Structure formats: structure tokens, C-alpha cells
From a paper:
To further confirm the recovery of the lipocalin fold by split DiBs, we crystalized the DiB2-split protein. Crystals diffracted to approximately 2 Å and contained three “split” molecules per asymmetric unit. According to size-exclusion chromatography conducted during purification routine of split proteins there were no signs of oligomerization of any kind. The main difference between superimposed monomers from the asymmetric unit is observed in the termini of the two β-strands adjacent to the cleavage site. These residues are involved in crystal packing interactions in the DiB2-split crystal. The residues of the hinge loop and two adjacent β-strands are also responsible for the main difference between wtBlc and DiB2-split monomers. The observed differences between structures might be partially caused by releasing the tension in the fold through polypeptide chain cleavage. Despite these minor structural deviations, the overall lipocalin fold as well as specific intramolecular β-barrel stabilizing interactions, which became intermolecular interactions after the splitting, are well preserved in the DiB2-split structure. This confirms that the split system is capable of spontaneous correct self-assembly to form the functional protein.
Numbering used by the authors:
A (entry chain B): 114 to 176
B (entry chain A): 23 to 109
The structure:
């Protein structure tokens, strides 16, 4: 399966990763939680690139 | 091949991407469904690919579990497009 970093911040602290089609998408962070600002940005980029963000499951993390 | 029309990071610095990432969110597939506290850890192989370790807590088993993969760039390593296979 394809693994593509479609967006990444300059500090390599937050990444948006997709698989071989728009049914595969991940939000990755160097930290177990992210802020509302980072959330909205990632979601905005996802929607701009034609991903349906209603498909996201918010993974439980310590935090 | 990446999906038609999506961006791919094209000045990728593979060395700064190495180490541990927390999975904040995912589209749900069978392979990951039900797993919590999911991390992805990347390390550089000698052959220039990446080793991938995906770890998560499975509350049904009460156990941490992990799956190991090998990733290769499909072109320039400054282009963040790879393909991963799991063993």
C-alpha cells in the first residue's frame, strides 16, 4: 500500500498522510494531543484535497 | 502511485521524519479498527528504505500489539511517496 506525506509543518511536528486513494488518511503528531488550531488547519487541507473528513475516527491517546 | 491531484511533500528530509509519531486520527479500516494509543516509529535501513513499527493498545485483548513493515520510496527520497509491505 501507498504511504504519502501530503502535508508537513516546517518543524516536522505535524503530518497529514494518505494511502493509495482518498479512503485512507491519517493525522500524525510528535505529541499525543494537538490544539484546536492545528486540528482545523489539517481538516482544511484534507477537505481542499477532496478528502471527506466526516470519515475521521479520533484515536484515544494519554491526554 | 499517490491519489490523483493530492500534494506530496517534495523537499522531504527523511532523517528529520524518523522516530515516533502519535496517530491522532484515521479513516477506519479492519487492520487498525479498535486500536487505541497508536504510534508509528520509523527508522532508516542500510538499503535506504524505512522500517515501520505500528503499535497500539487493543482493549479487547487487553494487550499492546505491533505490526512491522518495510517501506521504499517510489522515486526521489526528497519526494514523500513510498510503498509499505507488512511481515
Amino acid at each position: 500500500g501507498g504511504y504519502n506525506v501530503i502535508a508537513l509543518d516546517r518543524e516536522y511536528r505535524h503530518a497529514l498522510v494518505c494511502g493509495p486513494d482518498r479512503d485512507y488518511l491519517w493525522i500524525l503528531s510528535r505529541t499525543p494531543t494537538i490544539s484546536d488550531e492545528v486540528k482545523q488547519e489539517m481538516l482544511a487541507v484534507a477537505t481542499r484535497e477532496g478528502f471527506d473528513v466526516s470519515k475521521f475516527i479520533w484515536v484515544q491517546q494519554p491526554g | 502511485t499517490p491519489p490523483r491531484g493530492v500534494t506530496v511533500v517534495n523537499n522531504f528530509d527523511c532523517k528529520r521524519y524518523l522516530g515516533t509519531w502519535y496517530e491522532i486520527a484515521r479513516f477506519d479500516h479492519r487492520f487498525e479498527r479498535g486500536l487505541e494509543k497508536v504510534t508509528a516509529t520509523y527508522s532508516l535501513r542500510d538499503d535506504g528504505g524505512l522500517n515501520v513499527i505500528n503499535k497500539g493498545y487493543n482493549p479487547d485483548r487487553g494487550m499492546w500489539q505491533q505490526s512491522e513493515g518495510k517501506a521504499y520510496f517510489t522515486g526521489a527520497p526528497t519526494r514523500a511517496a513510498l510503498k509499505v509491505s507488512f511481515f
